[PDB]
Ligand binder design. Sequence first.
Ligand code: A1BDF
Ligand code: ZN
Ligand code: ZN
Length: 582
Amino acid sequence: NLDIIGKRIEKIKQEHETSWHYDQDHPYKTWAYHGSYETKQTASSMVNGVVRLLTKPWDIIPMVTQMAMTFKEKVDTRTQEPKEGTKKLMKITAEWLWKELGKKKTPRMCTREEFTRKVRSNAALGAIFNKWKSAREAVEDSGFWELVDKERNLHLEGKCETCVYNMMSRAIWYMWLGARFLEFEALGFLNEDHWFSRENSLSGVEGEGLHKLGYILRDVSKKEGGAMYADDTAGWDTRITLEDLKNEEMVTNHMEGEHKKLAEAIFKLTYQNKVVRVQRPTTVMDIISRRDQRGSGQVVTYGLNTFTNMEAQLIRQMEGEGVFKSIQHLTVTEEIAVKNWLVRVGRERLSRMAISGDDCVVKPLDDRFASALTALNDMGKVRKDIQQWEPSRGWNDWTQVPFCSHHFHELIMKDGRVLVVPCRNQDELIGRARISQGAGWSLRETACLGKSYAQMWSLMYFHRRDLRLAANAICSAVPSHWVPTSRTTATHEWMTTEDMLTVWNRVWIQENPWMEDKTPVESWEEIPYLGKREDQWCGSLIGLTSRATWAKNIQTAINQVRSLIGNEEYTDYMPSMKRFRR
Ligand SMILES: c1ncc2c(n1)C[C@@H]1CC[C@H]2N1
Ligand SMILES: [Zn+2]
Ligand SMILES: [Zn+2]
């Protein structure tokens, strides 16, 4: 309690000495509350005019148009302590999992140099405004690094002064760039050195890319066993227990010297004890604390979610296979059985899973897994939209399994070769491409963001008639040499000025380990579409009068956008499609 968080609390007390008051009408039940102080401030979604002018039929589709318009009483809930048997299962599994992940890796600190480079090419590290304008400026000023230095030496002393969260089924905890640096220095290696790659972790998909995920699910489907299970957790980040945070901290057992000490401080002082500031309209700032739940940087959150999800799913697999009988208590001989299972078949059981943070697909040895719920429920990983003790429903076909907001189609090229392609409802794709975030977008910057969406569609969603046509239209409407951009940056092969046919050949043929025949594709007409009925099932407007008029008159839409942008060098990509090729 207050000995680890007090210093942080004390410091804030003073910067607002004119405003401090222990409010008696505070709305917190599960968060420990400390005090309040005076503020008065808040980021709505803006429309991308380039993409909207080239997607006119979707102007009358509410599922698209409603996306651009516009629970914190789930952050304020509590998880129960798991039973002794559960805690033992988790500790044995976590110990074994860090050793496996460590066999072909070496923990190490990330550098000021590495951090500086990340900030100087716009990765969302969730920082705040103050003393310097942007992150770009703070990193070049040596005063910052003295602030970082002061904190760094405070952490080696086992104490914290400035590592405080700012709150804003989503909840994002921004920190000041300094606290973010120290998190990255100690734990950045998990992402920077690919601990959750499929090669390293067997269950993981870190860095794999949307073009690989379907091939990975088809490889899991080839294993002998039961249905494919894809159970979503209800508010995963809020169900992370203090026992979870303690098993995650065991990565420090593989560290040495300074690194070990810096990493122990991040886990102890910032993850297993937290200090947060929250906007309350009644407008004040509330200084609240709690020991459990996930509140880390988004990138460390991804890696530790993947770890604890891999652990939870191996234990659910152990329950289905009868490795242990009850979660109340692991006997002496059950412990040795669990250890022996892990050593004997643990790596095989990891390969039966695809795990992306809180998102999983599991192909267990058989369907006993469906009704193996005691460990999963007692660890607090309660399933979404199903009653606590109702057996999971599994999927019989890998092409129907949801994963990372997609499903996957098997698509045969006219030349016999097999593509496994990513897909989702087309209203979701079009609605997202019509949205920008933040202020001060020039017309050129708005055009370059539209071009980023268009090139992603050409590479990932070429098989959707409407998206291949709209992607060609946007790329024809934006000057040929203008560089695609984003403001928060899977593997993004579409972020390039290289010709998209050359990039398609590299991704889907040359570098595709599931494609034996490396014969290059010479034109977009060799690249197939879904069946027309399947395209309609997944949200295509093919067949509607609105869509026919849009396609027939597309040059008029392209020319409207070219007229707004002005007298620039453009390329016509529409003749890459059979119907515009005369
Ligand atoms: C153990 N620890 C770290 C690494 C390896 N093995 C293999 C390759 C070369 C360096 C890095 N990746
Ligand atoms: Zn600190
Ligand atoms: Zn589909």
